[PDB]
Paper text:
Three prime repair exonuclease 1 (TREX1) is a crucial enzyme in mammalian cells, consisting of an N-terminal nuclease domain and a C-terminal transmembrane domain. TREX1 acts as a 3′-to-5′ exonuclease in the cytoplasm and the nucleus, and has multiple roles in cells (1–3). TREX1 is a member of the DEDDh exonuclease family and adopts a general two-metal ion mechanism for catalysis similar to other members. Our results show that RNA and DNA/RNA hybrids are substrates of TREX1, although the activity of digestion is lower compared with that of processing ssDNA.
Numbering used by the authors:
A (entry chain A), B (entry chain A): 11 to 48, 51 to 170, 175 to 235
The structure:
């Protein structure tokens, strides 16, 4: 895989609520930039790679946010609308396609809890459009599966897998900007920079086509 | 003006060298998000608005970086190429157009020293393409002109205008990530959040069409 695209979404609620995306962040890193990272105990927080492409967009949903979602993300439908944000629409799809076309192929999306949340929700949003999906040629992986595989390989002898728990266990500092799409992508990147060659090997061996991801719910 | 688009570029050198862009960052903020900001002396560093759209892209140039440019930005042509970055091309123009089409109109670009560097350089890059410019319906302002107008209005009775100097004079802390496109956009945003209604009034009254900007050099 040439490019890893760290992905995170905010949305109006949990899966039971048939949620709609309110924020999306993609951070594209060439594999070389990750291989080149690198410390101590606790190690200092790694510096992000220098060469990165980033896209972060706020998106007006078609339904209200649940209280918990609004309160942890700091977003609401009414605030997004008063600030002129547009819906998840065909122009957004064109934007995503052009952004992906700038990345060396093949590309793999990497999201924390992606299999149960981000990937099926993104597929739901894309299925509502008239434009072919810009993600149909991409791959994806759930970073939690990679971390758990690393744990089993490093301690076969034998915990929160929240993003913040993992980061704090690694670096003994709390993360910043939790439950913002960009903040959570940056926290995930910092976690993956801890042992980057093992994220890469997991991705190279266990990535799957994004076209296999089923929508979270029907439209 | 509905949307302010904070803009900064990195490139291969100073204007005499006929430079090419190596990094571009746009940060779009609705005027409401800035009006809603707000402290002390020195005031604490303002929190950025919650609702923002961001695009940051690294770009392979057609010529080598000068030593000073490479050393302050941390970019080089060879590093950008080995990480698969593409040139400034028509797909990038499509990406910029789709990003701008998500913003409420009219939009005004805001860049620090934009009139003498960022705006004419961006116009040079866009002039090389076969696609009509995505910026031809936008406006622009140089943030330095706005700050100097604020100084004259606040002390008619009577210094570095470097981005870092201004930030440090305001907040008594050094900025972070200097000479990265995104870091410098974020520093500029923090400066503008000091007295946001006066950036806005300057923009509302003195913005000019980006189509008036002449290329930095001929192609
Ligand atoms: N505790 C709780 N209540 C309601 N909705 C929730 C909660 N945790 C997550 N979410 C929803 C809304 C978030 O935008 C989205 C992504 O979680 P993220 O962790 O930000 O990536 O999942
Ligand atoms: N001192 C020096 N030597 C050579 N080239 C320079 C120098 N200062 C700026 N530049 C060039 C290269 C930077 O990418 C660009 C933008 O400056 P920025 O301040 O990052 O926005 O201008
Ligand atoms: Mg998440
Ligand atoms: Mg999140
Ligand atoms: Mg600059
Ligand atoms: Mg800069
Ligand atoms: Na919910
Ligand atoms: Na259903
Ligand atoms: Na130069
Ligand atoms: Na010329």
């Amino acid at each position: 895989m040439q490019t890893l695209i760290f992905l995170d979404l905010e949305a109006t609620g949990l899966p039971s609520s048939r949620p709609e995306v309110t924020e999306l962040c993609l951070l594209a890193v060439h594999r070389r930039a990750l291989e080149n990272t690198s410390q101590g105990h606790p190690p200092p927080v790694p510096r992000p790679p220098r060469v990165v492409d980033k896209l972060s967009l706020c998106i007006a949903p078609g339904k209200a946010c649940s209280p918990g979602a609004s309160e942890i993300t700091g977003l609401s439908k009414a605030e997004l609308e008063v600030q002129g944000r547009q819906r998840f629409d065909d122009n957004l799809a064109i934007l995503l396609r052009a952004f992906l076309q700038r990345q060396p192929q093949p590309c793999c999306l990497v999201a924390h809890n992606g299999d149960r949340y981000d990937f099926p929700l993104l597929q739901t949003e894309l299925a509502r459009l008239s434009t072919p999906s810009p993600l149909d040629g991409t791959f994806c992986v759930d970073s939690i599966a990679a971390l758990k595989a690393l744990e089993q390989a490093s301690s076969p002898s034998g915990k929160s897998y929240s993003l913040g728990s993992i980061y704090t266990r690694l670096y003994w500092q709390a993360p910043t900007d939790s439950h913002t799409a960009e903040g959570d992508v940056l926290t995930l990147l910092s976690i993956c920079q801890w042992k980057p060659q093992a994220l890469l090997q997991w991705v190279d061996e266990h990535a799957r086509p994004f076209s296999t991801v089923k929508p979270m719910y029907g439209t």
